[PDB]
């Protein structure tokens, strides 16, 4: 139809995607272990009319040649992996990570995933899972005769038995670090699988190897601060309105061109 | 009459068809499993007066010959087979699909149909039907005394009898994959049928051979982008404006021809 109509259509698509990801982010506020997803854009074709070079005489150069441009193609909806807040659940089986670090999980389909959520549990067979059968590596089996379970800030999980007053270590719960924390792809339940865009996951113990610390009795809340994402919503809503205004302006444009 | 009026008439037909597609897409929001339709256009004959080649003299060649051209014949309508947004419906008889695949169904004629709508039912015989008595396939019989039905992500459907503390396995709900999802013919009732553009159906368990997974308590929403539909509506309205203006112009040309 009209060039401006196409360009503003692309803009409306882009801002609708912005508001879609913002609404998904609001959908996961106060849900611990969620990361503020953000959309990254990209401009499409530039229709060249006069080349920015295009020597217009023997000597004249014509700087800043005319070219129009189209579209706001969104390349991606990347996954922001930033540090969030921690809240007191007072549960020994709920662990929070402070700083860089990812929880190793052996996926039930046989692959490896990672999650920044440590609300682990104990099943009937003693495997350390977290709300969905998420087993960590290496495999740690809690003895059935255990009385109390304590997970140290260094990644050591241990149990206490009747009589003997010794906290013998039963397993090691080490973290996993990524060169790229964003490239990870989610497979649901806040699990993110190793990706070609994330870099080689280096298995490293907490405290050492430049990893973060473990907080027992705490859970990492989502990094979705209500204030910042409300500010984002206001800005994106303004952008959406103005783009729709451009679409309707091109409509009135054409209407008056046809009432001609 | 005039070679222009037939061309403009084909233009009116094309815009009318495209508006038909837009209206059908628009009206079928909130229809689960519906796939957005998009019409693809294509120009007809070019009646040539001077061939683009056809060397005139022994040195000249007559670049870019004169041919007029007609029409906007609507060559096809594709159907976008992308994953629709899931919503949590909280019903145990709503099963959605994550990934490629279709439920199979036995039509009353004996031939088989296919559908992506899991808003199932249980009829007075206890069998698994879909809103029209269409027996899903292979037939799944729910025992009378069952209190619940659970349909796993592997498609293994089992019920909980009263008294017995076991979910007796009542069947396997398998999907069907086609090589050309777009080529399936739609017959209404949210049902598709086999056609040679689609290819032979490959029946498979959910998860394997590239088939999808099953999400109980979710419904798959229609992937009808309201923003794109509305901008298409604006553009189609204006194109119809312009084409009717062309018809009017040719009509006035003809009437002044007649007056003389």
């Amino acid at each position: 139809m009209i060039s401006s109509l196409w360009i503003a259509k692309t803009g409306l698509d882009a801002q609708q995607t912005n508001m879609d990801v913002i609404a998904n982010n609001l959908a996961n506020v106060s849900t611990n272990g969620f990361k503020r997803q953000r959309a990254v854009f990209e401009d499409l074709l530039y229709q060249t009319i006069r080349q920015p070079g295009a020597q217009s005489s023997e000597q004249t150069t014509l700087p800043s040649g005319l070219q129009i441009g189209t579209g706001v193609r969104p390349v991606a909806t990347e996954r922001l992996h930033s540090q969030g807040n921690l809240s007191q659940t007072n549960n020994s089986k709920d662990v929070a990570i402070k700083g860089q670090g990812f929880f190793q999980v052996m996926l039930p389909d046989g692959t490896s995933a990672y999650t920044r959520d440590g609300s682990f549990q104990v099943d009937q067979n003693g495997q350390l899972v977290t709300a969905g059968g998420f087993q960590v590596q290496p495999a740690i089996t809690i003895p059935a005769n255990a009385l109390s379970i304590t997970i140290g800030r260094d990644g050591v999980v241990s149990v206490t038995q009747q009589g003997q007053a010794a906290p013998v270590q039963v397993g090691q719960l080490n973290l996993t670090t990524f060169m790229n924390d964003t490239g990870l792809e989610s497979i649901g339940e806040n699990l993110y699988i190793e990706t070609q865009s994330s870099g080689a996951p280096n298995e490293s113990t907490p405290g050492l190897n430049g990893a973060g610390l473990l907080y027992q009795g705490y859970v990492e809340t989502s990094n979705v601060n209500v204030a910042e994402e409300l500010v984002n919503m206001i800005q994106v809503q303004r952008a959406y309105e103005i783009n729709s205004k451009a679409v309707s302006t091109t409509d009135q444009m054409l209407q008056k061109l046809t009432q001609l | 009459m005039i070679s222009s009026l037939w061309i403009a008439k084909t233009g009116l037909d094309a815009q009318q068809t495209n508006m038909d597609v837009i209206a059908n897409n628009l009206a079928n929001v909130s229809t689960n499993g519906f796939k957005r339709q998009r019409a693809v256009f294509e120009d007809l004959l070019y009646q040539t007066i001077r061939q683009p080649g056809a060397q005139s003299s022994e040195q000249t060649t007559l670049p870019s010959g004169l041919q007029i051209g007609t029409g906007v014949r609507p060559v096809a309508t594709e159907r976008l087979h992308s994953q629709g947004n899931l919503s949590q419906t909280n019903n145990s008889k709503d099963v959605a699909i994550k990934g490629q695949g279709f439920f199979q169904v036995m039509l009353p004629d004996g031939t088989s149909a296919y559908t992506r709508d899991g808003s199932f039912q249980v009829d007075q015989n206890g069998q698994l039907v879909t809103a029209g008595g269409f027996q899903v396939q292979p037939a799944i019989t729910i025992p009378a005394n069952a209190l619940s039905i659970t349909i796993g992500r592997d498609g293994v459907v089992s019920v909980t009898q009263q008294g017995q503390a076991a979910p007796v396995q009542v069947g396997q709900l398998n999907l069907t994959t086609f090589m050309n999802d777009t080529g399936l013919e739609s017959i209404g009732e949210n049902l598709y049928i086999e056609t040679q553009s689609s290819g032979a159906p490959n029946e498979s368990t959910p998860g394997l051979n590239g088939a999808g997974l099953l999400y109980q308590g979710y419904v798959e929403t229609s992937n009808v982008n309201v923003a794109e539909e509305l901008v298409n509506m604006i553009q189609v309205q204006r194109a119809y404006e312009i084409n009717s203006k062309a018809v009017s112009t040719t009509d006035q040309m003809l009437q002044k021809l007649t007056q003389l």
Partner: peptide, 25 residues
């Protein structure tokens, strides 16, 4: 967060031909 699920769900059927103005939001 009562009027936030309502607010986030309001931004879906947003109708670019007549969207939330800045004044209303």
């Amino acid at each position: 967060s009562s009027f936030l699920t309502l607010l986030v769900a309001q931004l879906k059927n947003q109708d670019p031909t007549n969207p939330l103005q800045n004044n209303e939001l």
